[PDB]
Paper text:
A subset of ALS is caused by mutations to the gene encoding superoxide dismutase-1 (SOD1). While zinc binding and an intra-subunit disulphide are not directly involved in catalysis, they stabilize the molecule’s tertiary and quaternary structure. ALS-related mutations reduce the ability of SOD1 to fold, bind necessary metal cofactors and predispose it to disulphide reduction, which in turn prevents its normal dimerization. Dimerization, disulphide bond formation and metal ion acquisition are the canonical SOD1 PTM steps en route to forming a stable and active enzyme.
Here we demonstrate that ebselen and its analogue ebsulphur bind to SOD1 at the Cys111 site in vitro. Ebselen and ebsulphur were found to form a covalent bond with SOD1 Cys111 while derivatives with a benzyl substitution on the benzoisoselenazole or benzoisothiazolone nitrogen did not, possibly due to altered reactivity or steric hindrance in the dimer groove. The 1.3 and 1.5 Å resolution structures of wild-type, zinc metalated, disulphide intact SOD1 bound to ebsulphur and ebselen, respectively, allowed for the unambiguous placement of the compounds in the SOD1 dimer groove. They show the formation of a selenylsulphide or mixed disulphide 2.0 Å covalent bond, respectively, between ligand and Cys111 created by nucleophilic attack of the free Cys111 sulphydryl at the electrophilic Se–N and S–N centres contained within each respective heterocycle. Electron density is evident for both ligands except for a small part of one of the ebsulphur phenyl rings which projects into the surrounding solvent. Ebselen and ebsulphur form tight interactions within the SOD1 dimer groove, and a hydrogen bond is formed between the ligand carbonyl and a highly coordinated water molecule situated, on average, 2.55 Å away. Ebselen and ebsulphur appear to form additional inter-dimer contacts through parallel stacking arrangement of their arylamine groups.
Author numbering:
A (entry chain A), B (entry chain F): 1 to 153
Write the structure that this text describes.
């Protein structure tokens, strides 16, 4: 199995820890952890292309999209590799993350190691927002916290 | 060419930006950037195995050593892949980093993307300290700052 991890930090209250595990080469990736300091509701959750946090989350670039598709939700055929949908924060501002995804990987060209995980201010509309931006970014607003996805033991 | 980047953060503030560039997979990696907030002199400079900064630099694990060798300096045949020697801070506490290394890579099993770059409190003795620890860690003392090495544009 391969494992990865990411510490989410930003300029404000949002912080988190996210773990990734992939038992088989080309098998699904389990994503789990916790994010706090969020407003209650849905928050866009994306792998962005660059693991460049030199200017914070703004240096991370666009959604990780090695297969040149439009933006969608994780259960859509038409999605970016980095489109992990939304995490859900409760009224305490805590998101307990538990995702299984078949498109991201921890090896090869769908590999997300060395890229940036970002949690957003607003909900990702999953390409169903009714404007042009919806099928590019999902209209998820500001980047509240991010980190580089690293190899874990 | 492949490019990578790392933001080093640690108390001081010890803060740095380190860039990596490799023109072909068979080529050396150019490592350049700046680290500030250091004491004047030599500071050990290592790629540690895990890109895990969940508990700060301590979670990064040992020196990246995929070939099961002893610790050395960068110009030694007997070294860890992660053994980048020392950076040098001036009397303003600034290390201007300029290294070319032939052993680290931005691809393959010597790949350092997704691992942790660490700058240390003391000088790396490069395996020439005269105790057992010298040929494992180089006696470079505490981890001052670190970050996960990410893919850059
Ligand atoms: S997982 C990963 C993360 C960042 C850069 C490269 C990789 C990677 O595993 N790439 C591979 C491509 C082709 C064959 C093996 C590995
Ligand atoms: S470059 C990289 C970054 C993060 C995880 C894995 C890799 C990688 O490509 N590793 C390889 C090991 C052995 C053979 C090919 C690739
Ligand atoms: Zn995003
Ligand atoms: Zn997207
Ligand atoms: Zn070290
Ligand atoms: Zn070493």
């Amino acid at each position: 199995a391969t494992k990865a991890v990411c510490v989410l930090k930003g300029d404000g209250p949002v912080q988190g820890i996210i773990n990734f595990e992939q038992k088989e080469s080309n098998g699904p990736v389990k994503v789990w952890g916790s994010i706090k300091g969020l407003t209650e509701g849905l928050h866009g959750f994306h792998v962005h292309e660059f693991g460049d946090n030199t200017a914070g989350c703004t240096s991370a670039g666009p959604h990780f999209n090695p297969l040149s598709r439009k933006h969608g939700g994780p259960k859509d055929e038409e999605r970016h590799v980095g489109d992990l949908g939304n995490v859900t924060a409760d009224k305490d501002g805590v998101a307990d993350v538990s995702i299984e995804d078949s498109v991201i990987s921890l090896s090869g060209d769908h590999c997300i190691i060395g890229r940036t995980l970002v949690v957003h201010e607003k909900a990702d509309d999953l390409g169903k927002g009714g404007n042009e931006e919806s099928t590019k970014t999902g209209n998820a607003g500001s980047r509240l916290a991010c980190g580089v996805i690293g190899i874990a033991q």
